[PDB]
Design a protein around this ligand. Sequence first.
Ligand SMILES: *C(=O)[C@@H](NC(=O)Cc1ccccc1)[C@@H]1N[C@@H](C(=O)O)C(C)(C)S1
Length: 635
Amino acid sequence: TQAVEAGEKTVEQFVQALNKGDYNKAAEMTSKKAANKSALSEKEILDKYQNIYGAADVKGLQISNLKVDKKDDSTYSFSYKAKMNTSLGELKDLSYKGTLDRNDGQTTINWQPNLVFPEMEGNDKVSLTTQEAARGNIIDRNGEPLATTGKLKQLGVVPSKLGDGGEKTANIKAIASSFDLTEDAINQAISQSWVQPDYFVPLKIIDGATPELPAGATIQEVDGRYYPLGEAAAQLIGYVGDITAEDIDKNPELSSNGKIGRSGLEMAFDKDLRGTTGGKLSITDADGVEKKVLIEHEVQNGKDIKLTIDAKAQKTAFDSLGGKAGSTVATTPKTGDLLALASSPSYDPNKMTNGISQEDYKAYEENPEQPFISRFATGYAPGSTFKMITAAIGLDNGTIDPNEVLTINGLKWQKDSSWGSYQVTRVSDVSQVDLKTALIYSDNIYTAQETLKMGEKKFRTGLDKFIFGEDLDLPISMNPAQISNEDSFNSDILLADTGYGQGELLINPIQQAAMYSVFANNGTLVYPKLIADKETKDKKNVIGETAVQTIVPDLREVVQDVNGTAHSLSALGIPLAAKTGTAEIGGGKENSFLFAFNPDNQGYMMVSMLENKEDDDSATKRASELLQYLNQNYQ
Ligand SMILES: *C(=O)[C@@H](NC(=O)Cc1ccccc1)[C@@H]1N[C@@H](C(=O)O)C(C)(C)S1
C-alpha cells in the first residue's frame, strides 16, 4: 500500500510532463530498456512523443479514474481514463493500460507504445490528414458582402523574363508606371533573401482592370480575404492574419495553414467564422496500412454573420468624415439596429491582410490621428448634447418649468464667490432664457443653474436610470460609460459641468445613441444591436413621456429656428430634431458633436462627432448626405 501511493505519484508526474510539452522529463521517468520494462530508451521516447504529439498538436492531457494495484513483487499494474485536445478535436475516453516498476527505492514506468495511444504496439505509426475549413462571410442587413474570401488578381514579376540589364530597368519603369508602384520597391522585392532567378516575386493586388503587362509582369489568380468597403469599415470588421505557431500552441483546433482574426469582428467572431478542421487521425501498420482510427469528421465551413450594418450607410457615414478624426453612429432607434459604425481616419484592411509592407505599417501605428482606434467605442465627454438628458431629468423630478424664464446677463456666471474665478460660459447673450431658448442657442448657464438648483441627489437619480456602468451585449471591446470618477461629485463646480456634458463624463458614440433613444421611444431606452437575428432589448420608463413630448418639439427648433445651432440642416427640408455640441478638451482642443433623428417616424437616429476639430469644421456640416439617405430608406 505504501508503494502503491508512490506509484500513483509517478503516473501523475508522467502525465504532467506530457501535458506541459516537456516530453524529455517524462522520458527520464521510465525504466531501463529491457524485454518487459521500457521498449525504447530515453532519447527514443522523447522523439516518439515529440514526433507524434507534435504532429497532432496534442495539448491538455488530463486523466481521471486512476486505479493502481499490484501484480507481483516489483511490478504494479495501473490503468486510467484520459482525454486530450488535438487539431482535429477532443480525444475523450482513452483507456490507458500499463505496468509500473519498483526496483531500488523509486518507481519508474515500464514504457510501451500503448502509452502514446491505447491500441499501439511495436513500431506502429500515426497518420494525420486534414482539410481546411473555408472561413465564413460577414454580411450587412441586406446581404451585401462586408468580409469575403474570393479570387484576387495578384501582380508579380519573374526576374528571368524581365531582362539582362538595360531592358530590365526599362521594364521595371514600365511596371512601376502601369500599376502605380514605386521603382525602388520593385527592385527591393526582387532582391530579398528568398528570391531566386525563376521565382514569382509578388508585388501588389489589382482591385480593378488589369492594364497591359510589360515584359516580366504576370498575373496569378489566388484566393484570399477581401473587404469590399475597405477602410470604410476597417475598425469594425477588422482583418485576418497568418496563423503563427504561438496561436496553434494556445488553440490547437486552428488551421496553421489558414488565417486568424486579429481585430474587430474577424477576431471577435473567429470561432464562428473559421469553422472546424476536418480530417482523420489514425494509427497505421508498421508499413503504413490503416489499423485503428482515433478521430474523424468532415470539414465544416465557417458560418456566416449577418450584421445590422447598412453597407451603403456605412460607406456614406465614413466618407462624410473626409478622412478627419471622428466617428459616426447610425441606428434605427426603435429596435436598436446599428446601421453604421464608422471611424476615421482608417487603415486599409485589404492591404493589411494581403501582405503589408513594414514601412506602411509604421505609418499606421505612428499617425497621430491613430487610424487603428475604434472611435465609436472610445469614451468621450458628450458636450452640449447631454443637455437633453439633464433637461429631461429636471422635467421628470419637477425642477424644470418649461415656461419658466431665467434672467441671465452677460456671458459668464458663478453660483457664488466661493467658485473663485471659474465661471460657466455661454456663447449667446440672451437675457430671457427658458428651456426652449436654452436648447436653441445651447446655453450653458441655464443648464448650470438648473443643475445646481436640482442638486446632486436628484441629478444622479435620473442618471442612474440610464446605462452608466452597464456592459452592452455587443461584440465590441468597450468600457462602460461613467458619470464621474467616483460615486459623488463632491463639487458644485463639477456638478454644474456634468449638467452640460463637460465634466468627468465618458460616453462613447454607441452608448450615446443608446442613451438618446429615449427621445424616439416615449422615454423607453432601446439597447443597440449589431447581430440582425438577435432580439430587441429595451428598458422601460427611463424618462417620462411628458419630458419627451416637451423636449423633442424644442429640438425641432434647434434645426428650424433662424438662430438655432443646427440651422444649416433645415436646407434638407426633412423632419429633423437635433442638438449640436462642442466639447472643450483640456492647447484648446475641441470635439464637435451632432445628435439628430426623425421626430415624425423615429426611423433613424444619428450621433456623429469630430475629434480635435479644425476651425469652422463640425459634424453638422457633414451630416446632410447621411441624413438624406437615412430619411429616404429608414422610416
Ligand atoms: C456645448 O457643447 C456648448 N459648448 C460649451 O459649453 C463649450 C464651448 C466650446 C466651444 C466654443 C464655445 C463654448 C455649446 N454647444 C456648442 C454647439 O452646440 O456647437 C456651441 C458652440 C453652441 S457652445
